Design a protein around this ligand. Sequence first.
Ligand SMILES: Nc1nc2c(ncn2[C@@H]2O[C@H](COP(=O)(O)OP(=O)(O)CP(=O)(O)O)[C@@H](O)[C@H]2O)c(=O)[nH]1
Ligand SMILES: Nc1nc2c(ncn2[C@@H]2O[C@H](COP(=O)(O)OP(=O)(O)CP(=O)(O)O)[C@@H](O)[C@H]2O)c(=O)[nH]1
Ligand SMILES: Nc1nc2c(ncn2[C@@H]2O[C@H](COP(=O)(O)OP(=O)(O)CP(=O)(O)O)[C@@H](O)[C@H]2O)c(=O)[nH]1
Ligand SMILES: Nc1nc2c(ncn2[C@@H]2O[C@H](COP(=O)(O)OP(=O)(O)CP(=O)(O)O)[C@@H](O)[C@H]2O)c(=O)[nH]1
Ligand SMILES: [Mg+2]
Ligand SMILES: [Mg+2]
Ligand SMILES: [Mg+2]
Ligand SMILES: [Mg+2]
Lengths: 171, 171, 171, 171
Amino acid sequence: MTEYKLVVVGAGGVGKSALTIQLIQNHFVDEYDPTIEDSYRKQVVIDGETCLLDILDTAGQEEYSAMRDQYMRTGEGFLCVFAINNTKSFEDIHQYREQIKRVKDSDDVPMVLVGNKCDLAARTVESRQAQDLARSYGIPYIETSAKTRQGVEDAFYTLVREIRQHKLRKL
Amino acid sequence: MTEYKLVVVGAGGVGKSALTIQLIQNHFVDEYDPTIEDSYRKQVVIDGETCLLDILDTAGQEEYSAMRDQYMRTGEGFLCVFAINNTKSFEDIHQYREQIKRVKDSDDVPMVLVGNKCDLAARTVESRQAQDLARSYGIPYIETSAKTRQGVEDAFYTLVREIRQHKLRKL
Amino acid sequence: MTEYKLVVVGAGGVGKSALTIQLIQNHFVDEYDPTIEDSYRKQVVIDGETCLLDILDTAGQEEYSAMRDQYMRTGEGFLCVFAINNTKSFEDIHQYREQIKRVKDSDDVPMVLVGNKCDLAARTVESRQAQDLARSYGIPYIETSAKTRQGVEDAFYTLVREIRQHKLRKL
Amino acid sequence: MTEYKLVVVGAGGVGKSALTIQLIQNHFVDEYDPTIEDSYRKQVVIDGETCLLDILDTAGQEEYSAMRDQYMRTGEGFLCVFAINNTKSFEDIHQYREQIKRVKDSDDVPMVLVGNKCDLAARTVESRQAQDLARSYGIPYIETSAKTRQGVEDAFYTLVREIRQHKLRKL
Ligand SMILES: Nc1nc2c(ncn2[C@@H]2O[C@H](COP(=O)(O)OP(=O)(O)CP(=O)(O)O)[C@@H](O)[C@H]2O)c(=O)[nH]1
Ligand SMILES: Nc1nc2c(ncn2[C@@H]2O[C@H](COP(=O)(O)OP(=O)(O)CP(=O)(O)O)[C@@H](O)[C@H]2O)c(=O)[nH]1
Ligand SMILES: Nc1nc2c(ncn2[C@@H]2O[C@H](COP(=O)(O)OP(=O)(O)CP(=O)(O)O)[C@@H](O)[C@H]2O)c(=O)[nH]1
Ligand SMILES: Nc1nc2c(ncn2[C@@H]2O[C@H](COP(=O)(O)OP(=O)(O)CP(=O)(O)O)[C@@H](O)[C@H]2O)c(=O)[nH]1
Ligand SMILES: [Mg+2]
Ligand SMILES: [Mg+2]
Ligand SMILES: [Mg+2]
Ligand SMILES: [Mg+2]
């Protein structure tokens, strides 16, 4: 069985824990209850491969920067989240991505760009501009609704396929 | 994630467009304007790989300014299309074929032969005839109906499989 | 074609026979009952590979200290089963696994932990515990019910895969 | 796409041509027209691989036995067929198998045991001694019916799988 180290990264409030929790436990989290760091484990088959998803749920709040360094060392792939109703979240993602590359050096680093809360009728952020970005980045993009569970399994499973490719035809 | 430049080549009225928009907009068009150059991107997974399909819907028809020249050079794979109910559409294939080979300088070129309009009870091109040409070329031939969307995914994923395969070239 | 030698072990009455019969005879046969130890066979295709599964159904009854070493010795992978409503059979898993680690003389030996009787209401062993143990062993955890057939194939086929994967560290 | 060279062998009267023509044309052939040697080509997708199947249909007629050395020299894999209501032909696969080995000078040659005519109630060779012979040989065993089409695609696809596995044995 293969173990994959997924880190859920992103601006505070964007829906990280809720993403993570819909996966792990299949129920939506209303409570906005911050995070320092929380671990989750999940066994799934993806493309007929028995996978152990070891997901690290991180703190998005202005602080906890510094760990924002060693979980980046450790992570094998990042869910970069932001929220379709928040543009600054959209915007700081370039930050998160630059920090990552710097903590690993590597220019090629499994990441997936996730547009959360898409159940919200009120986007200040356009799929297209998200796409344009994932594009210049070289990475997939998926719009999700932790609330409605939609695209949740794809976000995570896609990130596994990214890592997996990255370890094998990543040369 | 792998991005792939695929070009939809052929003759006017074949169905290049219908084909295309069916793959992307997932719906059928007996209405699209007679083309020159129009682009499409599709994010998808094939063979557990996340793929970004960069599709150029080219044109044949009447006049067409300046296209052909260089789209080859950049095209990675070519979908060479013809209609089942048009014998002349079919002879033309050998000619698109031929320019690619010259622009590409090789016979490396990934292509998939497609016989569109699998739905007409008005065939004037025999499968057996198409199969041979394919066989001559040593490339796949898939019959399609943009109308009923029969075989359309196959055509596209087949060509991407070919590119994929081709990339192992002297490694 | 590959031959795969599977050995099912667990405490008496966990459902080892049933489980095997289900995969093989395709029905829940009840009182197959203890002490008769047979090997079954089944050709099947897993992930495009054709496999000959040679399954040994050990008689967990007047168990261990039969010629158990024989089989643990010629086994390539072990299906380690316990019943969901029997804590001791779960407790016993630790003993089977040490025996297997001794006889195979290796810490990494393909095996899958199985919680049989998914079906019974009267659960004594929560899934969390079994999953934490497997996690601790680096092995998959599947819940089955030989009775409703749920989970049965996944259980064995997750095993051939463990086997297949493990094979990869030879050379 | 990949090209695979399949040869169907077996005593006369067994179902070789009716197996090959069902695959290729999807029609049962009621008449018995003895074969010398026919070639067929069928393009298929196996396990996401675009395979061009070059199928050789050979003579069961002992008379044309001189042409075997040749087809055995070039074939990559052998569909070994016998009829479920004719022991002599079950007895004959043996001699076919030994010739292939000699010609090929190898113990591992892709083959598949095919017991055709699954549809006849006058079966005379039980699936168990076929299954047993197969395991001896170390190859798959498929029961087929050219008249009903049952098992025929299993039969050819399984041979493509053997070939591929077998080739893989070096990359
Ligand atoms: N409508 C909607 N609300 C969502 C969705 N995802 C999360 N939320 C809401 O957004 C708020 C933040 O969710 P949470 O998962 O805690 O975000 P977080 O990024 O983990 C925040 P932190 O950095 O502090 O850990 C919660 O009130 C939650 O219910 C979604 O897909 N749809
Ligand atoms: N029945 C049927 N009609 C089709 C199919 N594909 C295309 N057509 C018909 O072909 C006509 C032209 O299709 P279109 O895709 O625009 O042609 P083209 O090859 O794009 C044209 P151009 O080369 O000039 O850009 C339309 O009326 C459409 O209904 C198909 O699979 N089945
Ligand atoms: N409800 C339920 N009962 C089951 C299930 N599997 C087995 N059983 C029950 O367990 C009893 C014992 O099953 P068996 O398969 O013989 O277990 P065993 O491990 O072979 C026992 P032994 O090692 O002694 O031969 C069966 O008689 C049946 O009542 C299951 O998935 N669900
Ligand atoms: N009931 C039944 N009859 C079949 C089946 N396959 C073949 N037959 C019949 O058996 C006869 C021989 O079939 P054929 O395909 O010609 O056999 P062949 O072994 O290719 C003979 P040869 O060596 O001369 O080429 C035909 O009458 C055919 O219709 C089957 O699966 N079921
Ligand atoms: Mg959180
Ligand atoms: Mg067009
Ligand atoms: Mg038993
Ligand atoms: Mg014949």
